[PDB]
Amino acid sequence: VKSFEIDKGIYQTSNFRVVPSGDVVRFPNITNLCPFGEVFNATKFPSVYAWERKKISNCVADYSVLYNSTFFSTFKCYGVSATKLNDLCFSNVYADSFVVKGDDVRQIAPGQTGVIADYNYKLPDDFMGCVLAWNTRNIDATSTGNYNYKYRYLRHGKLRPFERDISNVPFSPDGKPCTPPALNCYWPLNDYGFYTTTGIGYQPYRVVVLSFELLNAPATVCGPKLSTDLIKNQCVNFNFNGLTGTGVLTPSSKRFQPFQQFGRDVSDFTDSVRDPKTSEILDISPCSFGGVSVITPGTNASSEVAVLYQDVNCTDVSTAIHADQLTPAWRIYSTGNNVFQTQAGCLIGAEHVDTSYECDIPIGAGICASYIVAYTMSLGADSSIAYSNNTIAIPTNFSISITTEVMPVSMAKTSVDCNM
Amino acid sequence: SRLDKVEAEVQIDRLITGRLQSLQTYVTQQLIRAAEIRASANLAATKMSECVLGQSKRVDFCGKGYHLMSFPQAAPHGVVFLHVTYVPSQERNFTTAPAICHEGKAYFPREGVFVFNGTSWFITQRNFFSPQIITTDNTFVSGNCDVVIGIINNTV
Amino acid sequence: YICGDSTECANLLLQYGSFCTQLNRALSGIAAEQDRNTREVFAQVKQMYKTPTLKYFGGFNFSQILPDPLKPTKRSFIEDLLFNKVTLAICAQKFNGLTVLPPLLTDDMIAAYTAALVSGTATAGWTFGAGAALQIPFAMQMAYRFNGIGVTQNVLYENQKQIANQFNKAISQIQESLTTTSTALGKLQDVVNQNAQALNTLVKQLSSNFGAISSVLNDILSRLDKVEAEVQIDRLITGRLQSLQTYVTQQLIRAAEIRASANLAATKMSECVLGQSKRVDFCGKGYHLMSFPQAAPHGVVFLHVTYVPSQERNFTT
Amino acid sequence: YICGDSTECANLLLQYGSFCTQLNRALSGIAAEQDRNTREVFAQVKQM
């Protein structure tokens, strides 16, 4: 409050929260090496009109062979980041392989159609992984000509995403099953013309699309991480198959489903997860938090304070103090007693007193402090009256008692130069 | 010193947007404080027109007693009333009867209760103890002696 | 609420100054003002009396008006009907950040206040408040209450049984018309429903996006590297901050309306309960012979004992 | 008012939660309470 003299009253101050202690990772026990060395160092690679979609599952990826190599010409990720890619056990990743020219890197994106990405290979607008292309001018590009790879450029309409046309239909703009070489009746197929000593834009590129079906299954393709064991009823960190966080774990009470994995209880609040090693645990991610508040008698009759924690049960508070876990970590700090009821929280440094007073200081629910004591409350001077018959009190002597009263009628007449 | 182009115009847009939300917040909350302060000022004008200019018979509005007078004083930004109240306290014990059955007929007193049947002597005021000798002006003819609870004779 | 916990999103929060201090101060001031409202309404009797435990005077059943020692709870029966009527649409622990703190003046203390007010109304004479009491046997009280109405004292004593029967039947009809009835207790549920709408809308605004990639933190944390991180996190912080500040402004406006109603309530418990307020169609709707308080969820429920005469005749003057 | 109508600007308005619903509810509550203002001022007589 930026003062030295500070009067008597509960004064709100900073926020307390329990620092998490442990570190818990729970992955599946699946161990394998991925076919990345298979698919990226391969011989047969299809064209764009017959792009091949390979499933990878039940593996342990590394994601450092992707980085610790200058084999890669253009490597751009869309939905994810580069370095933090092996922190998520994916679900059934898909490798889409094809071979393009030295020009078509600009097309392959969410949107940005062009020609071939409009006619031969269409992406969705959100669900992307990582797109990679590299130059292969020294394998298949003969300067005589590589006339073995084709594309299609004649389609009645554009594409829905992840859809592949193969059938050589005799393209005619009005239906019309034709016999090419009739007029306006061609084949949609067309070569490339891959040469060796030509320009860089005419050089063959190999393109791998990594679509990441994020976590619509119990995840299989993990990264090189090590799992620990469950630490129940204690604030720790998380890293499950695709989920991080910070919380307190406990067994469940669910009628959970075999395909389900998450809990998202009311509105994207996870609260219950299914362990990758055969259990189902709830998640109180609120370890403990709130705001502390100082009770002081007023720095002119005392100098001893009492800290009120707000939404606690005085059981995590004792452990978090006596193991140094609270974010308002002190240096000169002790605990003689611990008053707790009237659910407004831990009242550190007070005494239950049955002899209740006129409620000096408003603590929470009924309870009021003083002086340092913390009684509940005397609501008023308790009495009973004789309620018999005809006998009647009448005042005989009176008094006059001039009383003050305060009414504010005018706040500060302010103004703002709203250009300065 | 180190700005170049529309980059800095983005940065100054961020600064203007933050300061403009802060100023808008200031204006809105001072408007809310102005609404509360003018509600209080309307109460204050009401108390000056009521408590000071006359004896306002409404209870626990002006003072805490029975509001005999009122004296205003100015203040920094405010106003301070001095309610001259009236607090009666030396309680007693005296019996009563709600009626007087003199000769078979009801004498209720005056709208202005407590017939002093403290040994059947007087009829007083409500608040200040003031016995008055009972006469025919102090009551009225009312029916017969059917609902009289306490019989009092010798109505003079 | 803003930025649950990461490490660096708190730093991006500190890049927007000191809003969290402002919001905590504004809501604490609102909470203190609501406690002030309850103190100003209810805590107006220092001298808390005791229930006389007769609850029947002349013909006046104060049954179910005052609480009963024989019943387990210390609240009266009509208050229990009112508590049953108003819906709500260890400790709480939810990582919204949100909380509902409990009230200071707790509900049985509220009921003790209401019983004290009704007792000192029924007992303790007309001079209640400024003073202590007068030991008036409650027939003399409403014999006197027939004089702020412009009738004589003949009305009460000559008609005692009929007045008592109409009074008791009226209270029993109030019971029957509060048990199985309907939205003529609406305003308190309007308060509770609007609180629920505001708070649930706030939580849904956490569930929403603000033009970012995901609508939740710790997801984009898993796929953050650098400034893109700070782009999406700044978008989320800005959106959540505008939503929360809008919430704070509307809470303050609802607090203003609720304290206007609180000032009216304190005014009526001063005027109507503690004496006979001769101003017309302010306390009740007849001539305001009496008035009683009763507690409520988050409100106050009066009972105005009015006076409506209707058997007209024809007489020349 | 916000985003008169195009195609996708409506979707960017959808990206900002349910602000449109909040404002409509607020103005509707204003309308109903001022109907209550007029009723509690003028309609105070049972028998016209």
Residue numbers in the entry:
A (entry chain B): 290 to 660, 674 to 722
B (entry chain B): 964 to 1119
C (entry chain A): 723 to 811, 832 to 1059
D (entry chain C): 723 to 770
Sentences from the paper on this structure:
The spike (S) glycoprotein of the coronavirus is a class I viral fusion protein located on the outer envelope of the virion that plays a critical role in viral infection by recognizing host cell receptors and mediating fusion of the viral and cellular membranes. The coronavirus S glycoprotein is synthesized as a precursor protein consisting of ~1,300 amino acids that is then cleaved into an amino (N)-terminal S1 subunit (~700 amino acids) and a carboxyl (C)-terminal S2 subunit (~600 amino acids). The S1 subunit contains a receptor-binding domain (RBD), while the S2 subunit contains a hydrophobic fusion peptide and two heptad repeat regions. Among these, CTD1 is the receptor-binding domain, and one CTD1 in the trimer adopts an “up” conformation as a prerequisite for the binding of SARS-CoV to the cellular receptor angiotensin-converting enzyme 2 (ACE2).
Our cryo-EM analysis of the SARS-CoV S glycoprotein and ACE2 complex sample captured three ACE2-bound and two ACE2-free conformational states of the trypsin-cleaved and low-pH-treated SARS-CoV S glycoprotein. The structure of one of the two ACE2-free states had one CTD1 in the “up” position and was determined at a resolution of 3.9 Å. This conformation was designated as the unbound-up conformation, which is ready for receptor binding and represents a receptor-binding active state. Structural comparisons of the CTD1s from different ACE2-free conformational states showed that the “up” angles of the CTD1s were between 50° and 70°, while the angle for the CTD1s in the “down” position was approximately 22.7°. The CTD2s of the unbound-up and ACE2-bound conformations exhibited a hinge motion away from the spike axis compared to CTD2 in the unbound-down conformation. These results indicate that the hinge linker between CTD1 and CTD2 underlies the flexibility of CTD1. Interestingly, only one of the three CTD1s in the S glycoprotein was observed in the “up” position in all analyzed structures. Here, our results showed that the prefusion architecture, either in the unbound or ACE2-bound state, was retained in the cleaved S glycoprotein, and the conformational heterogeneity of CTD1s still existed.
